[PDB]
Amino acid sequence: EAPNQALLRILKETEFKKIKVLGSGAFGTVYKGLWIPEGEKVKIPVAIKELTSPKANKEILDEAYVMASVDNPHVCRLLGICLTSTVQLIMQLMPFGCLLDYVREHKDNIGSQYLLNWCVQIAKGMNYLEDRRLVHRDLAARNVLVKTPQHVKITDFGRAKLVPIKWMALESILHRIYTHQSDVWSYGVTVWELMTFGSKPYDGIPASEISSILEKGERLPQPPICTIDVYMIMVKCWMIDADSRPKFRELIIEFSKMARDPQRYLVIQGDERMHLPSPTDSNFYRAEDMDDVVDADEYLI
Ligand SMILES: */C=C\C(=O)Nc1cccc(Nc2nc(Nc3cnn(CC)c3)nc3ccc(Cl)cc23)c1
Q1: Could you tell me the residue ranges of all domains in the chain?
Q2: Which residues on neighbouring strands pair with residue 88, listed in sequence order?
Q3: Residue 139 CB less than 6 A away from ligand 1
Q4: Alpha-carbon span 198 to 105, nearest angstrom
Q5: E strand residue ranges, the chain
Q6: Which CATH superfamily is domain 99-264 in?
Q7: Are 150 and 259 spatial neighbours (Cβ–Cβ below 8 Å)?
Q8: From the candidates 62, 101, 138, 291, which is the catalytic residue?
Q9: Whose CA is nearest to atom 4 of ligand 1?
């Protein structure tokens, strides 16, 4: 294979400042904060994921390795780690949080243009991961984050290589096999998640019954807003024969074609008269000294 020449950047604890907590969990915690490279005259918005027990520091470093190895517009890119008593991952702050919560809170303002554009953007992200011979193994709406409403990025790699049952292929649930095509399956579930505005797939059914249900030939329903054209693509992702499933490059193509005429393929009431925040808005840039702020996407080496 060719050699992984990614640079891992070690940052000083004084070079950035946490500002608030965004969430707490098993790992530890995630802070909204600000990274000022010393002597650079830039302030960069970041998220800071911090942890201590050795056999779990190995896991955080592993995620960091993965995330330093990727560079694509639709993959959240890591900026550096900071070595203190607890390891801390510094990555580009994604201001609107996870897409799953985003569609839940904003159902009434999400148009078909936004939906299909998301579907394209993720198909691109995953196609890039496939180029980089990477398998995600945990692709879901909870693991896509929202930079702007018009820009989402894949962001959890705590399971990537070279258990979330209701998102996984059949070969994966039964034989622990994972390939790019089982990632396609989870892409299909994800799409379902979006088109149902954050619904829970197989709500109620305990994850132990999932394997046998799928075995019989049952799948998720057709979201009300879906034409058959979109639902058919979801369904092709849920074939048993993994080679019968579409390849991410084709998913990109099909959702592109659909996102040219969005209202021919998703029927939403009040569509086209809907507004979400845009970088061409007022106050769109606040979350008090934004003098010299630069989005990470534009600070390079
Ligand atoms: C989808 C599930 C979810 O909400 N996860 C969650 C909650 C809180 C914090 C994070 N991590 C995270 N957050 C941001 N920015 C953010 C904006 N609004 N919120 C609260 C909804 C969080 N940006 C990130 C960039 C990269 C990484 Cl790896 C994580 C985050 C996730």
Answers
A1: 16-93, 99-264
A2: 50, 82
A3: no
A4: 9
A5: 16-24, 29-35, 44-50, 78-83, 87-92, 144-148, 151-154
A6: Transferase(Phosphotransferase) domain 1 (1.10.510.10)
A7: no
A8: 138
A9: 98
